[PDB]
Design a protein around this ligand. Structure first.
Ligand SMILES: Nc1ncnc2c1ncn2[C@@H]1O[C@H](COP(=O)(O)OP(=O)(O)OP(=O)(O)O)[C@@H](O)[C@H]1O
Length: 280
């Protein structure tokens, strides 16, 4: 029902391989949206339509404060437009790079929000499959806003067969069995926790193949100082057997995960309304 004429477009927020995200003000309401714009000829020609349709379908299902919201979509002759919530503070990755690593309180708090987010997502039977700090945005208040649902999968009411993801965060089962499940996201969570504390994700190399070989061998080490209860949690997530990761369904879900000693001081109830600790 909305049209391009309905908005004043401002600065480009970022660019993807087949998309541009632009900050826009809706004239009729004065609201700010991040508008994702896809060229129809380009997505048809480069075979991206399945990913565009998947992103719209998955995002339409989501209604949780830790996810970017899809408010509306429209199209004209040349373009599709997705109106998204504007995450003013950009990617979580920017903050890991800037400050180098998070202290225990910040690690705990941001990990808790991600765990809360994943509990919601897996409860709806959806796997993300590309969870990483670049795909975790931050709103004006510094709460997380998970994004990038074009490679997500709605599981039909355990396993998904498309090969998708980012080498550093890909789970061993996707490499060796050629499928992913909810537990694959918990593997990515382990990588992200490690990255928050250590400054880099645990499987690192300058090319994907070398990363793959390390992942399948569980070849990684903790830096000398690494919060002991965080290390224990990481060891319970970075497990080759996907059925043995803390938080997976065969480990009886998110209850035991949230009960991990690392999260002891966490109040899970209204996390999105708590004041995040300052990063720095
Ligand atoms: N809702 C949003 N609010 C603020 N910034 C955003 C939002 N969505 C995306 N961005 C920024 O714009 C960039 C482009 O996002 P987009 O989803 O179009 O492609 P991408 O996922 O970065 O790249 P690719 O699709 O090629 O992997 C993001 O990397 C992010 O920095």
């Amino acid at each position: 029902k909305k049209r391009p004429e309905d908005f004043k477009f401002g600065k480009i927020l970022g660019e993807g391989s087949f998309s541009t995200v632009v900050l826009a003000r809706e004239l009729a309401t004065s609201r700010e949206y991040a508008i994702k714009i896809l060229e129809k000829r380009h997505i048809i020609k480069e075979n991206k339509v399945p990913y565009v349709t998947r992103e719209r379908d998955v995002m339409s299902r989501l209604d949780h404060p830790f996810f970017v919201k899809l408010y509306f979509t429209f199209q004209d002759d040349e373009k599709l437009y997705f109106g998204l919530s504007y995450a003013k503070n950009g990617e979580l990755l920017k903050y890991i790079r800037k400050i180098g690593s998070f202290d225990e309180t910040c690690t705990r708090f941001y990990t808790a929000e991600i765990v809360s987010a994943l509990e919601y997502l897996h409860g709806k039977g959806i796997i993300h499959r590309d969870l990483k700090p670049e795909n975790i945005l931050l709103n004006e208040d510094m709460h997380i806003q998970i994004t990038d649902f074009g490679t997500a999968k709605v599981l039909s009411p355990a396993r998904a067969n498309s090969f998708v993801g980012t080498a550093q965060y890909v789970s061993p089962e996707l490499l060796t069995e050629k499928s992913a499940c909810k537990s694959s996201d918990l593997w990515a969570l382990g990588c992200i926790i490690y990255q928050l504390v250590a400054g880099l994700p645990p499987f690192r190399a300058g090319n994907e193949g070398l990363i793959f070989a390390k992942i399948i061998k569980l070849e990684y080490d903790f830096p000398e100082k690494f919060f002991p209860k965080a290390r224990d949690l990481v060891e319970k997530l970075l497990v080759l057997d996907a059925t043995k990761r803390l938080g997976c369904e065969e480990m009886e879900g998110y209850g035991p995960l949230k009960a991990h000693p690392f999260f002891e001081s966490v109040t899970w109830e209204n996390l999105h309304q708590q004041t995040p600790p300052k990063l720095t």
